[PDB]
Structures are given as C-alpha cells and as structure tokens.
Symmetry: C2
Subunit: 275 residues, 2 copies
C-alpha cells in the first residue's frame, strides 16, 4: 500500500509532535506516506487505543508504529499477532525485544533527583503521570533509588498522581499546595505538567527558583520558553523514533538502515533550578 500507520494518544504536546515529525520524515525519505490515528470516542483511554490501532490494521497499512501508555502488555501481544509488522515506542515488548525502542527512564528519574539533591534540596515533592504507565513507574523508580542513596525514604515524599496533561498538572500542583506538605524542590513527570506548576506558583507569588526549584522531564521545546526557562531531563525522543521507524521500514520496504537503540539521557540546565 505504501503507507505506514501511526498511533499517538494525542496530537498535542511537542513530545508527540516530535514523533509525528520524525515518522513523516523517514517515510517521505522513501517516498511513502503516513496515516495517523489518535484516540476518539467515549470509550476508555485504553479501549480508544485498541480501537484506533485495529482501525489502522484494518486499512492494511504495511507497518504500524504505536505509542501508548494506556495499553496493557497483553494488548501489545494481541495487536502484534494481528499485524506482525509493528514497532512500539517508549515501552518494552518482551515477546519480541527489538520491536521495542525505549530510552533509559530509570536513569532519567535518577538524574532528576540528583539535580535537585545536588542543589541542596532535601524536602522534595513529585507530580507524576498515571501509576499504570510503565514509562512513569521506571521514571519514579530511578528517582527514588537516588533519593534512597541519600537517606530519603520514598514514603516521606509527597507524590500526586496525575495524567500528563496541562489541566492535570495544574490540579496536581493545587492539591500539593493545599496539602501544606513542605517542599523546596519539585519533580514533574513531564514538561507539560511542570509548566502548569509554574503557572500556579506564579499566580500565588511563589517564586521559581526563588522559593521552589522545579525540574521537568522530556525537554520538550516548550521548556526553553517557559517562565522561567524550564530545567528538564533530556530524553532522545527524535533519535529513538527515527531508529524505530527505520527499523520498521527495513522490514516493510527492503531498506538497509543500520539501527541504533542506545542514546544518552542528560539534563538540560536552564533557570528553574537553583540552590
């Protein structure tokens, strides 16, 4: 058919924009197209992804690129037997490992904690994504491993579960401030929620990095222009996507790209974190 299908949970956020751009790019390079699909309807986030991916498979896309933290591992196996030419981004796929392209989130969380701790912060707080998102769980695991090495118990750290969205981050920041739990450093599971945190703090006169140091995750390109410029853990999303899509193109169209799966995660130091 000359088309590869692509599922993303939403078109918003520079993170998903990056995935869309790179997929379109690699396909254009081989003179082929991309059909995009996102969650629609009144079903649950999970079922919305199942229906969307099945909709792509039904169109007979030569290959399907999939990213979703709402799908359960068992769903990945089902979708894969329905269409063996698939690649999964940001999550593992044990039945067929190289069909999975995922950065080192454990290391990512570790760096977030180290940034804060190295700046003298001992009382920290966290606003995360859904507890059922594996990319989030490993992100937090790494964060708390680093905290443990410094004598800080996971159980003593205020943690608000959220959904990675702008409104979710805003509500989570409010819930945190309302709890009265003390904290001088805040870790947000993604830049989107971090920006909303900066929004609330500004509304209440809570200075950043003055009174609170905030660090995000992803290093989406909305961060450099946050107020103040958002310090964020840099995830190699463009590179992993480029390689995930190239791997798929090899299987589908006979290209011979060399595939790389290891990229470093670093911290983009800006102005939201201070001593």
């Amino acid at each position: 058919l000359g088309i590869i299908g692509l599922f993303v949970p939403t078109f918003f956020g520079s993170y998903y924009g990056t995935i869309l751009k790179q997929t379109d790019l690699e396909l254009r390079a081989v003179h082929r197209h991309v059909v995009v699909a996102t969650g629609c309807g009144e079903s649950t986030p999970r079922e919305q992804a199942l229906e969307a991916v099945r909709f792509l498979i039904g169109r007979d896309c030569d290959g399907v690129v999939v990213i979703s933290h709402d799908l359960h591992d068992e769903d990945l196996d089902e979708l894969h037997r329905m269409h063996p030419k698939m690649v999964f981004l940001n999550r593992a796929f044990d039945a067929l490992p190289d069909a999975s392209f995922c950065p080192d989130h454990r290391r990512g969380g570790e760096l977030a904690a180290a940034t804060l701790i190295e700046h003298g912060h001992r009382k920290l707080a966290v606003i995360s994504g859904p507890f059922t998102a594996s990319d989030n769980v490993e992100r937090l695991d790494g964060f708390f491993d680093e905290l443990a090495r410094h004598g800080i118990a996971r159980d003593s750290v205020p943690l608000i579960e959220s959904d990675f969205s702008p409104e979710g981050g805003y509500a989570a920041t409010c819930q945190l401030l309302e709890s009265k739990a003390p904290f001088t450093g805040l870790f947000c599971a993604n830049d989107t929620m971090a920006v909303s945190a900066l929004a609330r703090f500004q509304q209440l006169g809570i200075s950043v990095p003055g009174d609170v140091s905030v660090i995000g995750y992803d290093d989406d390109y909305s961060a450099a222009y946050a107020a103040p410029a958002l310090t964020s853990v840099h995830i190699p999303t463009a590179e992993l996507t480029q390689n995930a899509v190239r791997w798929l193109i090899n299987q589908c169209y006979g290209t011979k790209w060399e595939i790389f799966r290891e990229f470093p995660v670093t911290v983009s130091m800006r102005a939201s974190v201070a001593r």
Copy 2:
C-alpha cells in the same frame, strides 16, 4: 481510496494540533483515514508546501485539506486544477469561494486593539507574523483600523516582523526592547510568540501585566497555562476545520452535512492584560 490528505506547515503548536485532531475526527466518523504531510527538505517554506501537497495529490487521496500561509494565491489555483477536490483553511480562494474556510481576522485584530485601548494603553507595540501571510495582514489591518479611530497613526507604532515560531517571538521581543521604543501594551500575532515575549519579560524583571500588558491571538490551549495566564483573541479554529472537512467529505463520500461558515471571534480575558 478512502483517504483524505492533509497538509500542515508543522505538527507543533496547539493550533495545528487542533486542525489535525478535527480532521482525524470527522474522517474517523465516516470510517476513513487521514494521511498527513508537512514541509520537509532544504527548499523554501513555499516550495516545501508545493512539494508536500503534490506528494499528497500523487497518492490519489480522495480529497486534500490544505493550510499554509507560505503558498501564494497562484499556487492555490495550480494545486486546485491538479486536484479539484480540495479545501483551503485560513485563507481565501476567489476562484471557488466555498472551498475557503476562514475566520474574520480583521475583526480579530480589531478586538486585540480595543482590549488594549479600553485598558488605557496609548503607546502600543506589535510583534507580527510574516508580512506576506494574508491572515496576518488582515489581522494587522483590523488592529490599525481600531487604532486610527482613536487617533493613533499606524506609522508611530513599533512593529517587528516575525515568523510565528517560539524562537521568532523571542528574538522579536528582544529586538523591541533593544530599540528602546516606549510601549505599555503589546500585541502578538499568535499565542506562541506571545508566550516567548512573556519569557523575555520574566528574564528581565518586566512584570506582566504590571509594567506591560500582553495580548495574544488564537487562544491556543497553551495560553490558559502561561505565566501569567495569557489574554488572547479567540479564533474558532475547531469549528471552521470541522466544517471545512465536512464540506470536503460531502463532495468526496456523499455525506449530507449542513455546512456553516460564520463563527464569532471573541476575547478570552485572562491575566496578562491590566489597566
């Protein structure tokens, strides 16, 4: 083929995300798909759009949705004779008017000026998009018509031409501050550049709305979470897209949607504008 093609100059910005979402939505509703294409390569923005649209037409999409402010009117006519089943968003198409779905940008600019003027601002400044973008020219025209009604000459207002991007807005704000031109109120052609302006002002201790009142355009959903919450001119992008795509679906697949082309533009008052 059961596919409609869609060209957007970029996947970034909630404005384009809205267009992508609504297009995907209306097509899913009729059990069909969308192939997306954006500008790629080292050609000029204009030629990148010409090549991308021709790439969609070459795949024999049943219909093609196109939005670009880099294309010249003559390009719209050429692309249209290559594929008569096309719809154009955010710009006019004189040869075939109902193939064009565009909000009232003149009125939009007018409201931006009135908001500022009604808040007592007499010394204003503007950061616009490219002068060659028709949606921008009418936006500015309306802005300056309102200023003229208040005894303010277009020629006395600092105007920095930019490109609608985050980095462009940042650079334009810097150029403005460096010029030393006085101003207490700033109008940004789009929320993206407005957010970058808020970024610069925060870096220099220039309070908003304290020292400078800032108003954006689009009312993209990144505005409510800007710091401070960005007051913006609300453009009915979701509605026009929904109707533009429905109109196209009628012509392509036999649906019988009633089509509406008139939606009001209003101002979303938040916290970036004060007396």
